[PDB]
Paper text:
The [name] gene encodes a small cysteine-rich protein that we named Diedel. Diedel is 115 amino acids long and contains 10 cysteines.
Form A crystals belonged to the orthorhombic space group [name], with unit-cell parameters a = 29.83 Å, b = 44.30 Å and c = 58.54 Å. The final model for form A includes the entire expressed protein from residue 25 to 115, the 24 first residues being the signal peptide that is cleaved upon exportation, two extra residues (116 and 117) being cloning artifacts, one thiocyanate molecule, one ethylene glycol molecule and 144 water molecules. The SD1 sub-domain is made of two segments 29–59 and 90–117, and is composed of a four stranded anti parallel β-sheet (30–35, 48–49, 55–59, 109–113), one α-helix (92–99) and two 310 turns (43–46 and 100–103). The SD2 sub-domain is formed by the first four N-terminal residues (25–28) and by a long loop (residues 60 to 89) connecting the strand β3 and the α-helix of the sub-domain SD1. The main structural difference is located in the loop 51–54 with a distance between the Cα atoms of more than 5 Å for the residue 53. Indeed this residue is in cis conformation in form A and in trans conformation in form B. Nevertheless positioning the structure found in form A in the crystal packing of form B leads to several clashes (distance below 1.5 Å) between Pro52 and Gly85 of a symmetry related molecule. This is also the case, but in a lesser extend, when putting form B structure in form A crystal packing with few short contacts between Y51 and I48 of a symmetry related molecule.
Author numbering: 25 to 117
Write the structure that this text describes.
């Protein structure tokens, strides 16, 4: 399968700042981040556990796993993540 799915998440924080959760400032609309299924900011070209093929598929270890924006909130409990918007990419099909 392909590790091309990701989410664009806009949120506010009760504690900490956007950088603490590897997000970027989007003042005056909070923070924005692009995550993989593990609820962590995307760190490669795709959301594989490791490298992917030319299409973003057949990645080493398959795709990062988890419950998406819900996991982003969960793992960042200490910051109090207030979700505003979530967009699933690829959006169109």
């Amino acid at each position: 399968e392909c590790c091309t799915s990701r989410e664009l998440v806009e949120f506010k924080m009760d504690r900490g700042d956007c950088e603490a959760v590897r997000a970027i400032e989007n003042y005056p609309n909070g923070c924005e981040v692009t995550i993989c299924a593990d609820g962590v900011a995307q760190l490669g070209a795709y959301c594989g556990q490791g490298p992917c093929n030319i299409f973003g598929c057949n990645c080493d270890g398959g795709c990062l796993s988890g419950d998406w924006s819900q996991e982003f909130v969960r793992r960042n409990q200490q910051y109090g993540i207030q979700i505003i918007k979530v967009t699933r990419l690829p959006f169109w099909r």
